[PDB]
Write a protein that binds this ligand. Structure first.
Ligand SMILES: [Zn+2]
Lengths: 128, 138, 61, 189, 316, 50
RNA sequence: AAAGGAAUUGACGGAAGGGCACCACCAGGAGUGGAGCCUGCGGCUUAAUUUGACUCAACACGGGAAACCUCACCCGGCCCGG
RNA sequence: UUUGUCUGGUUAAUUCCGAUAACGAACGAGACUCUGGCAUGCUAACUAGUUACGCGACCGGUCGGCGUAACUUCUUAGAGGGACAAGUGGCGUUCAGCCACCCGAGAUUGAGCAAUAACAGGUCUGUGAUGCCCUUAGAUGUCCGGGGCUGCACGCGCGCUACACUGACUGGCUCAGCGUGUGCCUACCCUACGCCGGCAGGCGCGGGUAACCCGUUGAACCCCAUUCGUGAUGGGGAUCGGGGAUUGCAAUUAUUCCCCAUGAACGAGGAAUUCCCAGUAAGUGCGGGUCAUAAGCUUGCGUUGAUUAAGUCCCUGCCCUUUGUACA
């Protein structure tokens, strides 16, 4: 089993929160990055840290990760909608007539952009 | 001129390969004079595979030590193949090295690539690495 | 007679002692159907089975 | 032109089954000069199938404890047994080994169920790699047990065993036990 | 995983009818009562596996009976993925219609029949000429093809002459020359019909692949080993090609090749030699009792039933 | 059975057994098994569907 | 001088359900158990057959394969190093 | 007192992902040390070698055969480098990861280390570690001498040797590797080579406190020819007689060895059961221990080297969750 333990995937994430301007997608660059940016004892931890920051940079640039901070949103405020006509600009709004009685008794409904539709017959809304 | 080894085990063979009119000698005896003859084709496998024209410029002298007999045979054939490929990369052009390496690797990878397996140690409580003693209950 | 079958998918190991896999077997010889049979031994997809009795489907053991 | 033992062509022999076409490794890539490869083949699931069939054949003759570990003894035995095939029958012996292994793997078998010691068995069928290696085990039994106590030596007995599974005579312990352990799967149904 | 690109090779490809052979017309005078081509007499043997439709003419002139082929037909075109649990159904403007994929198939067959040879060698030549081409053209652009006109004796005064072929030769294992029939299996998109990626899947499992295309391509593959034993071939070779990216057929790539024997290839594809000649003769045991006129043998597009049809006046 | 029926397309009948069980022989017969102190308030019957 | 009520943690079951392990089985191999022999232990005899250990967690274990020393053990005697 | 430490997925692992009144952590696991696998790239060297020479010996080749100038491939061993599930395809609540395949020496090398806390587990026979009780001069201190632990109507266990033709016996041939080597106390050592015997050995000159001498550690199995021919036989070598040598103050209750003789069950073992997943099981020898003499045991080293599985909770134990108590 090759599951990464707590230190090689917490330490890799605290390495990724700062120092994002140095990291990349290739493993052999980040492996050489990791000794200027940290004090790690011997290399098998450092190769495992480099493997997880390469896997995390493989993950992270196509969407949000839960564990990573809004330094991601600093990338999405650094790198990144409405329609032309709004979806609330429709020209006929169907209104079933209890709403029309409400609008008439709120001193509206003299103005007509709406169209009242026919009331339902049958009251079978419950489940058996 | 190259000398380049091949090993399988604590058996170690290195061939001394320099320029000539054709030769193969394993510790002063030629390749048709080695003792196991149910394994005669293993040492002859570059001679049958590459042909005697591919050896046509070299004098190969093989010196072996260590190991058993069969591990010594498997180091002889690997050292011979690495001898010809090291001569071919230094003195012949590299497409000939490419042709000789795909004709040698695709047949058998122990002709060019070593064996990383060594004998694992005995530990206590049993007569081998894994086996354990008979452990009566009553 | 004797109908040959081809494996498309493996459906997990089964049995009391865990010895028998069961697979989806599609027939080749004169017939076309896709059924479950259970095997003894290691299978991969693309294995060819040889069924003496040719009809029986096998749920569980 | 890779020839087995210096003398055997691998170019011409006929695997007449589809199910063992990738599971008897004798054809052109697996043409080797010798039945020794010193391989790393049983280190993964399904790398032991594309070990050559001759290499599996000489390793399965190493079986009992007087003859454990000794490979070149069985290389010598399989060499003289293949020459016994070429002298007694005179056909290509690689068709005799292919015909023995294709013909003698039992196509149906039985499993034990019944919660560990009340005997009610159930019939299922056999995977093809299990058929190939079951066939080599039923071919290496027979011949050693039929040259255990005899004046006959082993090489004639083993080559005759591969002959006797290549043609299907029912003196063959591979064929005899094939029919028996498929007919009890016929019986527990 | 070390593969080589498949180039497109332009040669002139001959589909010659029995009537369009003048040597079959030259051999019409002095021998025989039954004459056809080994494309056609395989299809009477391998009529048990066709799903898609064709026709075969029966031509009786006197006591000399001829099986000739249609002129506006896609009869050489291979069927594709035919016998699966789900066939290709798709439409013409998509790439994977059986219209273009059959047209992809015999383009790919005629490509690899010359691809796996050297042009540079001297050919193994026969002392006879091929008669439907004049030898004075210096373009030399034919494929390597042989034609062998051989003679069988069948009882009840029926003489079966099959116009057969051989398509290649290689140097043998002992110093012999050894005769090759070349045909080509093809892998168009291996996801849909339980399909296996041969770059991945035939590295141990060559035998999964034959079981796949016995299940997919049975009418195509059974026809080849039908004509093979009539050739009496010393070797059988089958070719494996695939397209480069899985949707766009403009490029295809050769992965590798396999070598067989025809009885090794008959029982592995469930061809029994006794059944195929019997359905060969049953049409002939009918059609030697028929009178002169025009005839037709088809396989139906929908149903598993064939007919011998009297063709009325002057179609073919 | 279906190859022996003289009637074409005879759907075979079902067996309607109404079983009462005591409280001792359900936990012997595993029909009903002992549950937690806080999931005893679940009186929805157990699912038979996937 | 407690008997009892309700509730928590733990141990236990001749309860229900999961999980792991070749000190588990399954696929299987070399074996062991039957045979002569070295060796330990139970008994039996001895003046003594010293001794600890008895299911893994005793029985080629005390690094214990002791001819004297080892040496505890027996038969007889010197010895203060009271 | 509980949640944190869990319905689930995943892991060799409370390893992680995910769910979430929990958020962040510590010990154990993992990390770490030692070993194994790679380097024509560095450092390199008469107690290590290669090779171009110079000469000798033998019919261009052979020479571990005798001595020189360059190099570090082979030997030794440091300093760093290197493999990370990193690259690709698929599966996957698109998250842990899992599977497949190239490039690669290498895509689970093996051992040490080992938490909370407990058992009436073993050891007062390792102790000038010991508390008390005991004996303490016709001693249970302490020495010298014969005897003992070795005895056998009989069990149980660890092991060795075999039940043969893949063998046995006789000749030939050719290859290892961990390491040991002259001692405060104290006599106790590794052995070359020459002479004499058929052996254990006798006798003398030498070398060695060690990469120097034993030692190229000329190991066994395996390999190649001879004979034997299914017989309790030429397998089995148990038991049993006379003789020679070595050790030692002393070999009887034969310590060990060799010569000759003798030829017992045993022909592949029944219910139960032991051990094991790649240089693994097993076959086969060689060192260390104990030792004035020394291994059927143990601890290592190598050599020849596979079948079979790539999973399950049926069995056997064990942990966990829910549940019942009048048990603490
Ligand atoms: Zn009841």
């Amino acid at each position: 089993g090759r599951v990464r333990t707590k230190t090689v995937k917490k330490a890799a994430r605290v390495i990724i929160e700062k120092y994002y301007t140095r990291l990349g997608n290739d493993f052999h660059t980040n492996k050489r990055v990791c000794e200027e940016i940290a004090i790690i004892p011997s290399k098998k931890l450092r190769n495992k840290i480099a493997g997880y920051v390469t896997h995390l940079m493989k993950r992270i640039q196509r969407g949000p990760v839960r564990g990573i901070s809004i330094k991601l949103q600093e990338e999405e405020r650094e790198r990144r909608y409405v329609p032309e006509v709004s979806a609330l600009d429709q020209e006929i709004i169907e209104v079933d007539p209890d709403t029309k009685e409400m609008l008439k008794l709120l001193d509206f409904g003299s103005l007509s952009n709406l169209q009242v539709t026919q009331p339902t017959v049958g009251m079978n809304f419950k489940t058996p | 001129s190259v000398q380049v080894f091949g090993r399988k085990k604590t058996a170690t063979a290195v061939a001394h390969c320099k320029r000539g009119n054709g030769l193969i000698k394993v510790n002063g005896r030629p390749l048709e004079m080695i003792e196991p003859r149910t394994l005669q084709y293993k040492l002859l496998e570059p001679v049958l595979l590459l042909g005697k024209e591919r050896f046509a410029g070299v004098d190969i002298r093989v010196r072996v030590k260590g190991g058993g007999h069969v591990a010594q045979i498997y180091a002889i054939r690997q050292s011979i193949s690495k001898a010809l490929v090291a001569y071919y990369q230094k003195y012949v052009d590299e497409a000939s090295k490419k042709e000789i390496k795909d004709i040698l690797i695709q047949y058998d990878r122990t002709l060019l690539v070593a064996d990383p397996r060594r004998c694992e140690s005995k530990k206590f409580g049993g007569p081998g690495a894994r086996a354990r003693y008979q452990k009566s209950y009553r | 007679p004797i109908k040959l079958a081809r494996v498309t998918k493996v459906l997990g190991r089964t049995g009391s002692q865990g010895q028998c896999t069961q697979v989806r077997v599609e027939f080749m010889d004169d017939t076309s159907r896709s059924i479950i049979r259970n095997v003894k031994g290691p299978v991969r997809e693309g294995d060819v089975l040889t069924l003496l009795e040719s009809e029986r489907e096998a749920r569980r053991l | 032109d890779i020839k087995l033992f210096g003398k055997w062509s691998t170019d011409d022999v006929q695997i007449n089954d589809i199910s063992l076409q990738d599971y008897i490794a004798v054809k052109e890539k697996y043409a080797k000069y010798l039945p020794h490869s010193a391989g790393r083949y049983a280190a993964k699931r399904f790398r032991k199938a594309q070990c050559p069939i001759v290499e599996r054949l000489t390793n399965s003759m190493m079986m009992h404890g007087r003859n454990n570990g000794k490979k070149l003894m069985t290389v010598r035995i399989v060499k003289h047994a293949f020459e016994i095939i070429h002298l007694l029958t005179g056909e290509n012996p690689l068709q005799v080994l292919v015909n023995a292994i294709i013909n003698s793997g039992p196509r149906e078998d039985s499993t034990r169920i019944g919660r560990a010691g009340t005997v009610r068995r159930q019939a299922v069928d056999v995977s093809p790699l299990r058929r190939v290696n079951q066939a080599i085990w039923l071919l290496c039994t027979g011949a050693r047990e039929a040259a255990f106590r005899n004046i006959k030596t082993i090489a004639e007995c083993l080559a005759d065993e591969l002959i006797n599974a290549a043609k299907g005579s029912s003196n063959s312990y591979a064929i005899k036990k094939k029919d028996e352990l498929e007919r009890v799967a016929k019986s527990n149904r | 995983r070390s593969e080589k690109p498949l180039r497109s090779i332009k040669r002139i490809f001959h589909t010659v009818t029995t009537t369009d052979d003048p040597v079959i017309r030259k051999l019409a005078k002095t021998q025989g009562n039954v004459f056809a081509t080994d494309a056609i007499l395989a299809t009477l043997m391998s009529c048990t596996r066709s799903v898609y439709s064709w026709d075969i003419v029966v031509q009786r002139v006197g006591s000399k009976l001829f099986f000739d082929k249609r002129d506006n037909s896609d009869f050489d075109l291979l069927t594709v993925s035919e016998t699966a649990n789900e066939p290709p159904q798709d439409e013409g403007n998509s790439f994977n219609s059986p219209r273009n994929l059959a047209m992809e198939a015999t383009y790919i067959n005629h490509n690899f029949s010359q691809q796996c040879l050297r042009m540079g060698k001297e050919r193994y030549n026969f002392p006879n000429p091929n008669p439907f081409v004049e030898d004075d053209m210096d373009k030399n652009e034919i494929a390597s093809v042989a034609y062998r006109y051989r003679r069988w004796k069948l009882g009840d005064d029926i003489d079966l002459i099959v116009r057969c072929e051989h398509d290649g030769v290689m140097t043998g294992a002992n110093g012999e020359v050894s005769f090759i029939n070349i045909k080509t299996l093809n892998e168009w998109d291996s996801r849909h019909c339980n399909g296996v990626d041969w770059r991945q899947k035939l590295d141990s499992q060559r035998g999964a692949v034959i079981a796949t295309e016995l299940k997919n391509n049975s009418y195509k593959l059974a026809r080849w080993t039908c004509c093979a034993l009539l050739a009496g071939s010393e070797y059988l070779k089958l070719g494996y090609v695939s397209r480069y990216h899985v949707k766009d057929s403009s490029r295809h790539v050769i992965l590798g090749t396999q070598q067989f024997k025809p009885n090794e290839f008959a029982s592995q594809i469930n061809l029994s030699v006794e059944n195929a000649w019997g359905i060969l003769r049953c049409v002939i045991d009918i059609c030697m009792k028929l009178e002169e006129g025009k005839y037709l043998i088809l396989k139906d597009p929908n149903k598993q039933v064939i007919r011998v049809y009297s063709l009325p006046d002057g179609t073919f | 059975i279906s190859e022996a029926s003289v009637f074409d397309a005879y759907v075979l009948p079902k067996l309607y057994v109404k079983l009462h069980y005591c409280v001792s022989c359900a936990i012997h017969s595993k029909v009903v098994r002992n549950r937690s102190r806080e999931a005893r308030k679940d009186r929805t019957p157990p699912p038979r569907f996937r």
